[PDB]
RNA sequence: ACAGAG
């Protein structure tokens, strides 16, 4: 917090209260909360030979595997989740036309990192209840008017 | 010349007509050799955004 | 002056990494190995330690004392 | 000729350039004045083109 | 084929060299020829699943399948802005003699996360500078520096 | 009926001046039965057209063959038998300019009709007897089916 | 005090009305719009924030037939609540299942 | 009695940048009170004041008399001063990010489904438009998919409800017109607005901006009145940010990087142009130089050198613009005229 | 700085203010946002009537 | 102690000065796949007229620098070249020209264009609106000429 | 009297 030298003194008294993160950013419980859609990189034509090696280096270090089927290297997608989409397949001129970089729309990969106040499985459960609470409040006012 | 920053090491023992300081200054992520000659990265004036 | 408690861009607590970061640089890690060992994946957290100037360690000489 | 540990006793900053005065507590700089060289034959046109 | 293009158009965000395509959400009633995109709670409850792929202290990664962007983004926004926590708002300073300015020290102490479970506390009312057992905690920082 | 015009068209060029756009292509076509040349923009993402394709193009004043011109609003959700069930591609637009052929100084019969489908333009050019029933500020349905 | 206010369009007998959801932002607006647009009796639906300084959204609904727009709005709130109820039950099952598997391994 | 009340919403207040070169540098505005310290106004009025939001300051005067309100409101109001006195051209019009957003919206490649059509249009339903029924037009494409072309969404600016009487008409050449199309041009650069519906053409600076006439807001001013022009500008200022901020629009180092098709061309031009200059150098110092009429031999050499060096820039310039793709962000801003020019692109 | 230019043809006036300007596209073109601190100072004399 | 508000002047080491115009929450910012959202959004329209290509390189050299613990030099008539920093970004899994796949924070749907992302040095200027807002109703007057 | 800002 501070850093001192002899003769110097700090004495204070803090008052912690409850608040939401829309008010001030010291109330937010998450380091970052975000999502990404899931990749499905698909090979339109079979990539064999020494083009299989340069296709495995145009991606993240664990998604394309090169396997030997007859003493010959063929490439297949193995774990497309680990891809960050640096779009290095478009710098190469021969291999732009064999891939279809895409994203599955209805498949999200949430990443919730908490700051330590309460663990992140409880954070998502609390967050879902808040949206349930927002819908509950306006149902009460449609009942109050009508 | 107008950027807020840090006047020097004596800046807290210094009483001036008007002094501006930035609370959490950072040194430039991209820098000239001239920045190293004048020692600007010892008392920098700005933040990486 | 002194290391900020939270990263401006995301709010990860980088304010406790500073006394570790200087220690690892005595064991002759590089900067890019030292930040990876503390858990700073995103570059917005990395610039907190990489661009910081420890001014309070030098203002506190001039500061009055007994 | 002081060392940075002895600037601290004087409340002065090692990086402070100097080159200025303190007169009645304000820091005042004599600026560099640009001049013409004396003792040199200028050859120039008058207003009337002579 | 036209049908194959429609299926890509309503199910895959495709990444080009110069721009992303198929960004918007389109599965609404009357947007397509034969598809019946009206709301059906049973079709939602069938397709929806959650897979927790990693979890430890302070971190979690999980997959939601079958939910739309307009609801997954609501969960992202609540976690940032609308889930409450306990944090310092008032600092009462007695004899601060450090080089750190009081307004800077108070800002720093605000950003420290407090382990208090926020469900057990109520919101402090408007005004009410003291507060009570129900709705505040208190901490005391007191440090004197001396020579060894 | 509510049909204005109907003929089979053969595609003769796809992009005369290069591929200026991704989704839209400028089809230049010529008809068998009558000497009609056709300029037509189509969305080639949803409906792909090749350089040799032959299609049937009907322009109609109403989408219901019983001749009821009742179009207060168009409801996509509503399902009744109509003309669009026989055709693959349908556009709605307005006839906005009828213009005479400039290329002969005497005894001419060629006319140009311009329709704009929200900015996707059509020029239909031919003998005046075949373009009968077009009027400026009238709203027409294009309908289009590819033939094997 | 009241969080909801209804503002009917000037010519229209209750099939067009703007809902001023007070103390709200894009969080409810875009989620509720999605559930209303899934109803085949809605013609137009969309929201705008009046001003960044103001915590209001003007949710406009217009319906095709004779039915009043209050009914799509109420169905929209209920179905969104049932979605968030079902999301929670699935999530809490998967956390418990993950913790039980991890505790059953290496023991 | 006289009550000296505070300034409240609807006060006529004078507003003025410090250097005034013409009468439009001081205009009267209706005040609205807001919490933050700055003075704020819609960026369509930046061109009369020559303001640029870089720490600029402006003056405000509150007329203390009922007679001074009326003279300020009727004579000096912004709606009464849409055109400069000088050549009669509009100065309050669209500016950057209201021309670029409108251009990208009205391009032929844009198609919207019903959910995104409504969410762009619903932005205009604020203020005095809060009571109108919104008039979603019929879709263009029906059978494969139900799509709205972006020109239709733009037309909701010009007529947002069925009771609105506006029937705008315009027919003009766009910026990048080939000269032979006559509404069938390949660039889609011929504008037709028939009965407040945009039938063809994208909206450039020459149609939505402050440069000159053939502006659709100038048509509305001269044919339907001052209030209709001011409404449409407020709708464009509200609608185009909602499109552009959810489309995305960005410039990067890859938008100014020379491709291989230029680096070969540029090397040929430099070698050819320098060697032609070197021959005229030799023809001056050690031979015959065809001395152009009216100038000395030295001067004749400057005009030949400037000829060669202009050809290098122009040919290297016309080589870069042929290898740039569409959706190159400097090229979009040059085409729609919102910022920059083909010189600036070719120069960097 | 004499009478005829400095004090007669143009002169300092009250009920006036000055501030930094910043954009706001959600205002109409005939409107200007005035901060509360200026609005509480700049008063208009409203004559009391029915 | 002053916190940035609307009307405070910031600048960016290449003459791209600019007053603050809006302050938006973290929940409303666009966000990358890694969760980063920007501290400042800068309008692209400044660059074509002004040709500050050095700002575009500073963003790229800095980004490649923070990802591997380096300070890249920007010295006049020298400095670190684009060809070197492009290869640093791809080694760390970012795109070589710094453009990233960005999701809209308002709608949750992805943006069509890739957005340039990086650290740019920004310096706060002494000109603050709090020291410049001024208003006079009536007040003190000069003695010679009875005017303000 | 000098420096600034637009
Ligand atoms: Zn961070």
Coordinates of C-alpha atoms in Angstrom, one line a residue, chain J:
Chain J
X1 CA -6.6 15.3 -6.8
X2 CA -8.3 15.3 -10.2
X3 CA -9.8 12.3 -12.1
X4 CA -10.3 12.5 -15.9
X5 CA -13.7 13.8 -17.0
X6 CA -15.3 15.0 -20.2
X7 CA -13.4 17.9 -21.6
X8 CA -9.9 16.9 -20.4
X9 CA -7.2 17.1 -23.1
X10 CA -5.1 13.9 -23.8
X11 CA -2.4 13.6 -26.4
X12 CA -0.5 10.7 -28.0
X13 CA 3.1 11.6 -28.9
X14 CA 2.4 12.2 -32.6
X15 CA 0.3 15.4 -32.6
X16 CA -3.0 13.4 -32.5
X17 CA -4.3 15.6 -29.6
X18 CA -7.9 15.2 -28.5
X19 CA -10.3 16.1 -25.8
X20 CA -12.3 13.4 -23.9
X21 CA -15.7 13.1 -25.4
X22 CA -17.5 10.2 -23.6
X23 CA -16.7 7.8 -20.8
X24 CA -18.3 4.3 -21.2
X25 CA -18.3 1.3 -18.8
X26 CA -16.2 -1.8 -19.2
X27 CA -19.4 -3.7 -19.9
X28 CA -20.1 -1.6 -23.0
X29 CA -16.6 -1.8 -24.5
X30 CA -15.8 -4.2 -27.4
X31 CA -13.7 -7.1 -26.1
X32 CA -11.2 -9.5 -27.6
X33 CA -11.0 -13.3 -27.2
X34 CA -8.6 -12.9 -24.3
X35 CA -11.0 -10.5 -22.5
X36 CA -9.0 -7.3 -23.2
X37 CA -11.1 -4.2 -23.8
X38 CA -9.5 -0.9 -24.6
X39 CA -8.7 2.0 -22.2
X40 CA -9.1 4.4 -25.1
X41 CA -10.9 4.2 -28.5
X42 CA -9.3 6.3 -31.1
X43 CA -11.2 7.3 -34.3
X44 CA -9.5 6.0 -37.5
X45 CA -10.4 9.2 -39.4
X46 CA -7.4 11.1 -38.0
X47 CA -4.8 9.0 -39.9
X48 CA -5.6 9.5 -43.6
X49 CA -5.4 13.3 -43.7
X50 CA -2.5 13.6 -41.3
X51 CA -0.4 10.6 -42.4
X52 CA 0.8 9.7 -38.9
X53 CA 2.0 6.3 -40.0
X54 CA 4.4 6.4 -37.0
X55 CA 1.5 6.0 -34.6
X56 CA 0.4 2.9 -36.5
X57 CA 3.9 1.5 -36.2
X58 CA 4.3 2.5 -32.5
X59 CA 1.1 0.5 -31.7
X60 CA 2.6 -2.6 -33.5
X61 CA 6.1 -2.4 -32.1
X62 CA 4.8 -1.9 -28.6
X63 CA 2.4 -4.8 -28.8
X64 CA 5.3 -7.1 -30.0
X65 CA 7.4 -5.7 -27.1
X66 CA 5.0 -6.2 -24.2
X67 CA 4.4 -9.8 -25.3
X68 CA 8.1 -10.7 -24.9
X69 CA 9.5 -8.2 -22.4
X70 CA 11.3 -5.9 -24.8
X71 CA 11.5 -2.2 -25.4
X72 CA 11.5 -1.7 -29.1
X73 CA 13.4 1.3 -30.3
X74 CA 11.8 4.1 -32.4
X75 CA 14.9 6.2 -33.2
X76 CA 14.7 8.5 -36.2
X77 CA 16.2 7.2 -39.5
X78 CA 16.5 3.8 -37.8
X79 CA 14.5 1.9 -35.2
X80 CA 13.0 -1.5 -35.2
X81 CA 11.5 -2.5 -38.5
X82 CA 8.0 -3.8 -39.2
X83 CA 9.3 -7.1 -40.7
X84 CA 10.9 -8.0 -37.3
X85 CA 7.9 -7.1 -35.1
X86 CA 5.4 -8.9 -37.4
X87 CA 7.3 -12.2 -36.7
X88 CA 7.2 -11.6 -32.9
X89 CA 3.4 -11.3 -32.9
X90 CA 2.8 -14.5 -34.8
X91 CA 5.2 -16.4 -32.5
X92 CA 2.9 -15.4 -29.6
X93 CA -0.3 -16.3 -31.4
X94 CA -1.5 -12.8 -32.4
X95 CA -2.0 -11.7 -36.0
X96 CA 1.1 -10.3 -37.6
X97 CA -0.6 -6.9 -38.4
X98 CA -2.2 -6.6 -34.9
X99 CA -5.8 -6.9 -36.1
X100 CA -7.9 -9.0 -33.8
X101 CA -11.3 -10.7 -33.8
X102 CA -13.5 -8.4 -31.8
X103 CA -16.9 -9.0 -30.2
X104 CA -19.4 -6.2 -29.6
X105 CA -20.0 -5.5 -26.0
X106 CA -23.5 -4.1 -26.7
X107 CA -25.0 -6.8 -28.8
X108 CA -22.7 -9.8 -28.1
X109 CA -22.5 -10.5 -31.9
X110 CA -19.0 -10.2 -33.5
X111 CA -17.8 -7.2 -35.4
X112 CA -17.3 -7.6 -39.2
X113 CA -14.1 -5.7 -39.5
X114 CA -11.0 -6.7 -37.5
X115 CA -10.0 -4.0 -35.1
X116 CA -6.4 -2.9 -34.5
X117 CA -5.4 -3.4 -30.9
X118 CA -2.2 -2.3 -29.0
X119 CA -0.5 -0.1 -26.4
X120 CA 0.0 3.5 -27.4
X121 CA 1.8 5.9 -25.1
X122 CA -0.7 8.7 -24.1
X123 CA 0.2 11.8 -22.2
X124 CA -2.2 14.0 -20.2
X125 CA -2.0 17.7 -20.9
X126 CA -2.3 20.5 -18.3
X127 CA -5.5 21.9 -19.9
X128 CA -8.5 20.8 -17.8
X129 CA -12.1 21.9 -18.1
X130 CA -12.4 22.5 -14.3
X131 CA -9.7 25.2 -14.5
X132 CA -11.5 26.8 -17.5
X133 CA -15.3 26.8 -16.9
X134 CA -16.4 30.4 -16.3
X135 CA -19.6 32.3 -15.9
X136 CA -20.6 35.9 -15.0
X137 CA -24.2 37.0 -14.2
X138 CA -23.4 40.5 -12.9
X139 CA -20.3 41.4 -10.9
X140 CA -17.5 43.8 -10.3
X141 CA -16.8 46.6 -12.7
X142 CA -13.8 48.8 -13.6
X143 CA -13.6 52.2 -12.1
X144 CA -12.9 54.3 -15.2
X145 CA -15.3 52.7 -17.6
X146 CA -18.2 51.2 -15.6
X147 CA -18.1 48.0 -17.6
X148 CA -17.0 44.5 -16.6

